[PDB]
Scaffold this active site. Structure first.
Site, PDB file in Angstrom:
ATOM      1  N   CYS B 404      37.513  46.241  -7.437  1.00 42.84           N
ATOM      2  CA  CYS B 404      37.116  45.373  -6.329  1.00 42.84           C
ATOM      3  C   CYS B 404      35.628  45.493  -5.978  1.00 42.84           C
ATOM      4  CB  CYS B 404      38.122  45.449  -5.187  1.00 42.84           C
ATOM      5  SG  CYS B 404      37.775  44.155  -3.973  1.00 42.84           S
ATOM      6  N   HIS B 525      42.933  44.985  -7.850  1.00 42.19           N
ATOM      7  CA  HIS B 525      43.256  46.398  -7.821  1.00 42.19           C
ATOM      8  C   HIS B 525      44.280  46.732  -8.916  1.00 42.19           C
ATOM      9  CE1 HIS B 525      41.058  47.688  -4.220  1.00 42.19           C
ATOM     10  NE2 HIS B 525      41.128  46.398  -3.851  1.00 42.19           N
ATOM     11  N   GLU B 527      45.429  49.571  -9.702  1.00 43.97           N
ATOM     12  CA  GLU B 527      46.206  50.720  -9.263  1.00 43.97           C
ATOM     13  C   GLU B 527      47.644  50.343  -8.923  1.00 43.97           C
ATOM     14  OE1 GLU B 527      42.850  50.523  -6.144  1.00 43.97           O
ATOM     15  OE2 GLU B 527      43.341  49.401  -7.956  1.00 43.97           O
TER      16      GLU B 527
END
Ligand SMILES: Nc1ncnc2c1ncn2[C@@H]1O[C@H](COP(=O)(O)OP(=O)(O)OP(=O)(O)O)[C@@H](O)[C@H]1O
Ligand SMILES: Nc1ncnc2c1ncn2[C@@H]1O[C@H](COP(=O)(O)OP(=O)(O)OP(=O)(O)O)[C@@H](O)[C@H]1O
Ligand SMILES: Nc1ncnc2c1ncn2[C@@H]1O[C@H](COP(=O)(O)OP(=O)(O)OP(=O)(O)O)[C@@H](O)[C@H]1O
Ligand SMILES: O=c1ccn([C@H]2O[C@@H](COP(=O)(O)OP(=O)(O)OP(=O)(O)O)[C@@H](O)[C@H]2O)c(=O)[nH]1
Ligand SMILES: O=c1ccn([C@H]2O[C@@H](COP(=O)(O)OP(=O)(O)OP(=O)(O)O)[C@@H](O)[C@H]2O)c(=O)[nH]1
Ligand SMILES: O=c1ccn([C@H]2O[C@@H](COP(=O)(O)OP(=O)(O)OP(=O)(O)O)[C@@H](O)[C@H]2O)c(=O)[nH]1
Ligand SMILES: [Mg+2]
Ligand SMILES: [Mg+2]
Ligand SMILES: [Mg+2]
Ligand SMILES: [Mg+2]
Ligand SMILES: [Mg+2]
Ligand SMILES: [Mg+2]
Lengths: 559, 559, 559
Positions: B404, B525, B527
């Protein structure tokens, strides 16, 4: 600013509302400017959505707020005007902090019941108690807070937590707690363990009571006082009792006899509040007027009977402003009142087949009465029974007042029977059939204080004479339906004069019938503007008319 | 449908989230379909408004819901997809019943916390647990409810009341309670009175615990088990412990060693749930895979160091999905991970005047690292320090991933230093001066699962090979600012290739730099799509690149 | 009191029962209180002795009367409760006057069919029409009499003679005659001589028809109307037609389109009947609800399939309350219904030798279905086939409802296959061999409306949630056999919970199985308490469960 919390107990029916109103009026006898706030643990934003079958009627404020009934007890004892802000609720304050968190005023912090919601309650109480509520310009000296529900009900938790903080976020000697509590009697012995448990439940939340106000069917024994004053921090003179007397106007003098002002005069340091020479006079004058009206209830015996005709009359809380408006009007006449509670449906001829007992009793009660009231309240049950009461009152020449729906019922009655339109009816319930003889129509509400203008010819009417022959009147409205203004000239030609209307016309607000001693109706609720020394004018008309002496009442009002 | 409440304790930091996620995955080893619900006593509707400085990061769902961090623990242990409905809050449910009372679905009744709000909570839990959450079509067999906050905090009251009712509004043997509780050690003796008080606070609300899960810095003594199992209703095998081990992946096997499944297999009658022959195989296969990854953490020693450069790195909860994404990527490589936490501001040359100690330590840590991550998170602090880390990683040829804000920082760095535009900058903070060299621009959010299309020439890139050379990628977005698409062709000509974009173009989503072993960034993102057996592809790239063997990883992925 | 005779025709199958029920409900749209009487020319005292293979099922009243099926059409269209007196028969009235002649109330006179039996019929009709049949206290305004059999059958003679007298023994404008008659079509031409002969047969008995109601496979031609209205006394608007539409709920609106109320409103002077303002509202509201449910049948398309498994399913009249209960439950779900009629014996493996075609078709139909119903009806044919359907529904997790015998079949199935008692069986047919594994036992009937009490733990069950979580249920019983209460604890331990029992216990009335989406049974017949706007709760459960949305149905019912 001083605060007096009135709180809790063991039950929800305990009668805090009388004690809060009475405590505030006693403080007003010192000349202090007074205000009050009702807290409701319910999730409704207002009492407007919720049906009269629970917590009694909604009460209408000048704002058009459909508030909890307890605000009316404050307005009529204290003489104050309340705003829709003076009824706090769980629904209001969670809606406030949730809308405020979505707007983001909390700067991206995590929002929690403590401190953020309890600080929002304390900000509400601080803002709202400083609203001026007398007709004068001044900010109040004292605020009475009434904590609704019971202490340790999970519904109450944010308010008992907020009020703990508030006892410090405002100074001590600027805050005090009255706890109201049940002292049941069993085998004639005055049992105290319910109130000992309620005093522990206050201490568990950190709220410490400055007076314990027992509610009991007896005078407390001196042992009953000592067994509470030894368990709790309160002194013997701080265990108050309020007895199950019928006259709620006697409660201020029963608290004064128990020396309750002489405690708060110390405990709130009310001698440190500055007062002018006008304030002390208008304060002591108000006490003498209350001694007189209570003396008149002790020694007036000559009963006037008013029949009140409506839905669900077993719920006597559903008509509390009517009841109090009739009691103010009977006291002004120096006459005792009986209300006869007529369930309007039982008047209807189908009842004479279904349960012949209820038929004959309801028609006994209606025939017995010196005057008749049709009180309002929406819903289709019993309306032909209310039409039958309006008919009986018109034909037998018996004094009649119709309030809100009661005016529309009298218009429907006069249309069905004097104009002879046999199927003319309310638009509220038949309009699935698209009927042409509309007596009501829709005109999403009309609410709060509005002006009525008296129509130009109306000088003759008993109702306009009761309003002092003033050209305009200010009263509280609440309706979605009104008289069809296409049919109004037919009624005004047949003698049912719409004596008053809205500024725009086409919206009728008062009628009086030519050729009856007192047959009147109002679209507004005249109950809500009643005050103990200054009764509601349409009700002072009804209760004088039932008694006789309506001319002498009007002659008096001309001074 | 079976329910397993995980609850309470004496403190808010106790680690329920690991135990809930671990208990659910252990039930998944039986082949049961599993789901979970997080309850938060806070008044925020979502974790999106609230800053990362409290309760760690917000977690993004496929819906675009900015939920509480604990939903990520469930998605990554259980393998499920959660909806914005699976994070219940005080803000959500009071907003729900208040909007429902204003709409009037409660038929003019008085609305109260009991039964109306507690029945609304029970309706939410019943609706939401039956949402299918695996990729298969089936409704879940078991739901884990995690009760946030602590029991007897006033914030929790509607949820502890609702869950008492729920134990009967759903059958017993379809509901069970795990209570998680603190067993502090003083002078080496394992003190039990905090957990005895927490077990009483459950009984006071009528919630009866079926297991007590101690959190302690030791193995419980057999006396510590007996002194709890004698005070509470739980048997000796129902006093669970979870030790302060670093590897949260060991907790499922520490619960399995304590025979915790063999209790719930009786107490929830999980043998009465029907299961197919595929279900039991895919269930037992999942357990063997978890035995292998935990064996690899016991016997892998050869450290890869990743430097994580960002704001407020002392709040290690602020980057928990990054941490877990790096740990999944290091396990897939069979290598141990160190994360070096670099507070990005301390890299900046002003620090060398203000506190020369913090300057030298932060530049030691960054120089030490085998690869670099810039993790995201809005706010203007330290961004030149993050630009300095991106510079260092580009120039020294050290593996870099920018997530990001980390991608935009690498674009600003490449513009300032390789294009040589010395004042080119983020639109986020300088636009009060209306600067022409805009690197970011605004394009009120872009949120949730979105498609990235790989641009046509991109077949060469290590990042597109890590995504299996598939033409499209699905990943979770969260941003208001993106690369200025007027300047994109300058970067794509100078070698900073925007390898992937939104379907519409003019919105860049992946870059890889020509002429570096692994220098990559993502607007999404990566993750949040990591899973224990299937790590996030950009992170599997970074942690392979730091180790070497990025070619062999890509060769594997081509199978 | 007004009377409307519905009568006769050329054939016994003509569909008077729909037209009588529809005519009565149309009168109920005016707000009139309505009742009805079925006359049967058969010599049976009741429909209880006679087998379901003739005149369809017996219908059970709250009295425990096993009445003619046509009483159910009245209860479900009109919303009324009928007594065993509302089904008149030849057997009843000859038994009445013969017992009265032996008692001697006729004072030694010769007793004759005229006047004594015809005056006894007229006394029956006068007594019975004044029984209050709504939940309210009022006597009915209108009575519909349905004259069973055909006019000029010798079986009918006392009733056609009695009804001639009745047209005068009650006033004209308080009595009217509808004649229902067959208009067959041959070579596409609508032949009228059968109805001309039936109109003469009425005149021969002195009965004069006020409307002629044609039953035909077409719209009547305007020539077909004129050729009847010229032969008979009826005007063109008094020749009614009812078309062969499938939806019997459309018939009230097809009569309303033919302006049939506007004739009876004159011909019975229904404007002279007094009605209250509640009555006209609850009358017009009922019409709008019927416009909505018929609109929903015009525009709902998304089929739910229910398989109905039983004896003699070719006699679709044998299950008419099941059919109507399923249709009410499908309309409440806004879904179209298919019923799949499975002859239960054809499911049995002997069929695969005897007629392999019938075997494969019956198992196709059962496998196809979204939910399963086992409907009741005594007799030993096909019960292993019904056991096989209960097995299939338990094992494949397909929604199941077992009514009366269908509950006992599910108990026998669960015993044979889940408890593994391979020879456990009904006491009804094997007890010549004195078997120890009794699933049924005898407990000479249990009949009519009885209370079921829900057993204390039952709060979890979908069936108790469908009954609003009320503690007790009122439903109609009809059985001599019940579950062996010695074996009940084995089933309740293995998960087949007997959720409800009689007040005394030892008599099981509702079961729900733990671990199935909806597997339920009832000892009572839930069909008989179904109403068009308020479907039978166990059937609303089944047809929601088959569709999905059983949670949303239960959430709705909690309002
Ligand atoms: N001391 C009292 N003397 C006479 N009547 C009382 C007394 N206390 C309570 N009541 C009566 O009981 C009813 C409820 O009293 P009140 O409204 O003051 O109680 P409350 O605590 O405010 O109840 P609520 O919370 O519903 O508003 C009223 O009819 C009131 O007149
Ligand atoms: N048994 C445990 N073993 C290791 N670490 C733990 C354990 N329990 C808690 N923690 C750690 O403590 C922190 C908080 O744990 P967790 O999120 O599970 O607690 P929680 O009760 O859900 O807190 P919160 O309500 O804020 O979400 C995390 O860093 C977690 O890894
Ligand atoms: N107009 C109609 N439209 C549709 N179906 C009809 C109609 N008339 C009769 N039927 C059907 O024919 C069968 C018999 O109808 P119905 O019960 O009303 O006739 P009946 O004269 O009362 O017969 P019975 O004397 O045996 O009771 C039922 O299945 C019914 O649904
Ligand atoms: O039946 C029994 C037995 C024992 N006890 C015992 O409990 C003790 C406490 O006394 P109480 O419980 O009677 O309480 P109290 O009189 O102080 O309070 P009130 O509720 O009447 O205001 C003592 O009286 C002791 O005998 C009972 O009260 N009741
Ligand atoms: O200082 C003192 C004096 C007295 N007591 C007294 O209180 C008693 C209760 O014993 P504890 O209070 O020590 O509690 P415990 O050991 O059961 O619980 P943990 O908190 O250790 O799990 C007895 O031990 C008695 O001597 C103390 O505990 N401490
Ligand atoms: O075969 C023949 C011969 C003679 N007739 C004769 O009988 C007469 C009566 O006419 P119908 O008998 O045809 O009767 P209708 O048409 O009035 O009645 P529906 O049954 O069609 O409603 C005349 O039509 C005359 O020719 C027949 O009807 N059929
Ligand atoms: Mg109450
Ligand atoms: Mg009150
Ligand atoms: Mg904290
Ligand atoms: Mg957590
Ligand atoms: Mg036949
Ligand atoms: Mg019939």
């Amino acid at each position: 600013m001083k605060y007096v919390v009135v709180s809790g107990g063991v039950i929800s029916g305990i009668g805090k509302g009388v004690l809060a109103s009475s405590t505030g009026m006693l403080l007003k006898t010192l000349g202090l400017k007074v205000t009050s706030i009702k807290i409701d643990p319910y999730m409704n934003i207002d009492a407007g959505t919720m049906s009269p079958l629970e917590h009694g009627e909604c009460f209408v404020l000048d704002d058009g707020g459909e508030t909890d009934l307890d605000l009316g007890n404050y307005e009529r004892y204290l003489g104050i005007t309340l705003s829709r802000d003076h009824n706090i609720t769980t629904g209001k304050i969670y809606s406030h902090v949730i809308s405020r968190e979505r707007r983001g005023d909390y700067l991206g912090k995590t929002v929690q019941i403590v401190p953020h919601l309890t600080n929002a309650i304390q900000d509400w109480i601080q803002r709202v108690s400083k609203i001026p509520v007398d007709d004068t310009g001044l900010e109040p000296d004292v605020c009475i807070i009434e904590l609704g529900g019971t202490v340790g009900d999970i519904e109450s938790a944010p308010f008992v937590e907020a009020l703990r903080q508030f006892q410090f976020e405002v100074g001590r000697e600027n805050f005090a707690l009255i706890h109201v509590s049940l002292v049941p009697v069993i085998h004639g012995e005055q049992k105290t363990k319910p109130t000992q448990a309620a005093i522990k439940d206050l201490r568990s939340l950190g709220l410490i009571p400055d007076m314990i106000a027992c509610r009991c069917s007896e005078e407390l024994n001196r042992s009953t006082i000592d067994k509470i004053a030894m368990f709790c921090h309160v002194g013997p003179e701080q265990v108050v009792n309020v007895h199950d007397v019928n006259s709620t106007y006697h409660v201020p003098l029963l608290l004064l006899k128990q020396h309750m002002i002489d405690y708060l005069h110390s405990r709130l340091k009310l001698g440190e509040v500055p007062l002018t020479l006008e304030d002390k006079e208008r304060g002591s004058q108000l006490l003498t007027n209350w001694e007189n009206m209570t003396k008149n209830l002790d020694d007036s015996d000559d009963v006037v009977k008013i029949a009140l005709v409506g839905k669900y009359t077993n719920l006597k809380d559903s008509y509390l402003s009517v009841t109090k408006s009739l009691e103010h009007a009977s006291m002004k006449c120096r006459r005792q009142l009986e209300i006869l509670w007529v369930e309007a449906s039982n008047l209807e001829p189908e009842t004479q087949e279904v349960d012949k007992n209820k038929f004959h009793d309801s028609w006994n009660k209606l025939s017995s009465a010196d005057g008749i009231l049709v009180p309002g309240g929406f819903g289709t049950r019993g309306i032909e029974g209310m039409i039958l009461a309006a008919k009986w009152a018109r034909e037998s020449g018996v004094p009649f007042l119709g309030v809100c729906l009661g005016l529309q019922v009298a218009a429907i009655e006069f249309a069905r029977n004097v104009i002879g339109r046999p199927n003319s009816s309310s638009t509220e319930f038949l309009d699935e059939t698209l009927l042409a003889p509309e007596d009501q129509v829709v005109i999403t509400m009309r609410l709060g204080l509005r002006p009525t203008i008296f129509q130009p010819n109306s000088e003759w009417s008993n109702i306009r004479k009761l309003y002092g022959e003033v050209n305009e009147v200010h009263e509280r409205h609440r309706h979605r339906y009104e008289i069809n203004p296409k049919i109004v000239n037919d009624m005004e030609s047949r003698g049912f004069i719409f004596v008053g209307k809205d500024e725009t016309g086409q919206r009728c607000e008062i009628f009086e019938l030519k050729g009856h001693p007192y047959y009147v109706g109002t679209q507004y609720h005249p109950e809500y503007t009643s005050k103990v020394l200054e009764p509601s004018r349409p009700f002072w008309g009804l209760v004088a008319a039932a008694s006789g002496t309506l001319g002498e009442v009007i002659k008096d009002i001309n001074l």
